[PDB]
């Protein structure tokens, strides 16, 4: 078994889902669902589509580089399948997932910080410019 | 392979029975293998298709009595024709006993006309076919087909020359005698 990352969205592609394309260049492209496959068939650029992870990574909407992401790699060199190592990896994956979620939440908070001041300023502008409405209200 | 069938072979025997003499009207291009405006006993005309049977009948009457066309499929049946109420003229449909260079098979229905371009090239010298179009000193006859297609503007979508159509037209013109050729005695 192997979950594949969508070429157009990087989303996990579980077995028996989506469509795969093989070109004369002797490489394979996997699409999670028909939407991504149709978008690719139109020669669209994922970096210019807002609903694909490529744009978010390029646009900086989410943490693009982090230390946690270094754990996940294509292990071209296998391991001898030690029983203790299996349990250690099982615990480490959960710990890394929790840490990555915390870091992503922190990054989102840092990106969204300051919206409160803008909202307060907009409310002040709306209140100041509508005296008659307030007078009629009370 | 075409130009023969039971319904076609039957007519030959019918005209032979209905005719008392047969005269050679075979093509003059290959003696070893007649126009309207220029040139009771039943005489039957025997020969391959596109040999001159219909044209020879028409020129005798000085009018287009019989249908004449380059296509071998002139007619599957014969009819009686008379001149001066002296001799009866009967022309059998062309029968080829058990090809494309001869007026036998229509070039339209052939799926692979390109391979016959070397055949026509063999019959005629370089200059004789060059004088027909005079486009280049061609070599690699496929290149000759492409050159003729470009000269005549016979190109498919994208810009590729129409090799099949150009070859078909070349063979059709060869059937008309546009490119002179003859068999040495």
């Amino acid at each position: 078994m192997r979950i594949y990352q969508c070429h157009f969205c990087s989303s996990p592609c579980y077995p028996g889902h989506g469509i795969m394309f093989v070109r004369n260049d002797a490489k394979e492209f996997r699409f999670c669902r028909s939407k991504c496959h149709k978008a690719f068939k139109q020669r669209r650029n994922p970096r210019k589509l807002k609903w694909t992870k490529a744009f978010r990574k390029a646009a900086g909407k989410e943490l693009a580089v982090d230390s946690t992401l270094t754990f996940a790699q294509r292990r071209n060199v296998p391991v001898r399948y030690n029983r203790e190592l299996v349990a250690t990896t099982l615990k480490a994956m959960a710990r890394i997932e929790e840490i990555r979620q915390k870091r992503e939440r922190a990054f989102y908070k840092n990106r969204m910080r300051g919206n409160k001041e803008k909202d307060f300023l907009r409310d002040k502008k709306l209140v100041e410019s509508n005296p008659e409405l307030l007078r009629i209200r009370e | 392979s075409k130009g023969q069938s039971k319904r076609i072979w039957n007519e030959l025997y019918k005209v032979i029975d209905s005719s008392d003499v047969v005269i050679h009207v075979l093509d003059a291009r290959d003696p070893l293998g007649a126009s309207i405006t220029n040139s009771q006993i039943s005489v039957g005309f025997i020969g391959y298709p596109n040999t001159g049977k219909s044209s020879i009948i028409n020129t005798l009457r000085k009018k287009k009595v019989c249908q004449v066309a380059p296509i071998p499929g002139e007619t599957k049946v014969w009819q009686y024709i008379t001149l001066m109420k002296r001799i009866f003229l009967i022309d059998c449909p062309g029968i080829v006993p058990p090809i494309l260079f001869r007026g036998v098979v229509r070039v339209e229905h052939v799926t692979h006309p390109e391979q016959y371009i070397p055949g026509v090239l063999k019959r005629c010298q370089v200059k004789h076919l060059e004088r027909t179009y005079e486009i280049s000193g061609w070599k690699d006859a496929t290149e000759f087909i492409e050159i003729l297609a470009r000269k005549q503007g016979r190109l498919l979508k994208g810009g590729e020359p129409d090799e099949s159509g150009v070859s078909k037209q070349i063979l059709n013109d060869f059937n008309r005698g546009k490119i002179p050729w003859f068999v040495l005695p």
Binding site: P15, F21, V22, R23 | -
Partner: protein
């Protein structure tokens, strides 16, 4: 299955019916193949014989070196270009449908094969895999 097959054939979607044109994938000089019939297919009323990846078909070369034209020889399809069910659980399809020409014994006319070669064809035909520089 015809001679040269070393195992059972998987059930895959029919891509090339009779008369379908498939590009060549060998250095034999041919460029396109015209399918006239499919070997091992059970003919039924109104049902045009159709091939698929790894199938052996009889075809006549339409374009390429004239020496190979007008003659019918067995051909093996290397690319289908129609989605088929792979047991690994992926609906994969190839960019262009293509085939190769080989004798009934399975020996490849061309010394080598160009472009990707389907897994279901290389696995079933040892000669195709040996003469194919790319699989999948």
């Amino acid at each position: 299955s015809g001679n040269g097959a070393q195992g059972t054939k998987f059930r895959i979607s029919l891509g090339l019916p009779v008369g379908a044109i498939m590009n060549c994938a060998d250095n034999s000089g041919a460029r396109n193949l015209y399918i006239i019939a499919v070997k091992g297919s059970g003919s039924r009323l109104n049902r045009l014989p159709a091939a698929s990846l790894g199938d052996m078909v009889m075809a006549t070369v339409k374009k390429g070196k004239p020496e190979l034209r007008k003659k019918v020889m067995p051909a093996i399809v290397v690319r289908q270009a129609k989605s088929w069910r792979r047991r690994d659980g992926v609906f994969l399809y190839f960019e262009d449908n293509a085939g190769v020409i080989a004798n009934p014994k399975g020996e490849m006319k061309g010394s080598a094969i160009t472009g990707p070669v389907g897994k279901e064809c290389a696995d079933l035909w040892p000669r195709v895999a040996s003469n194919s520089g790319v699989v999948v």
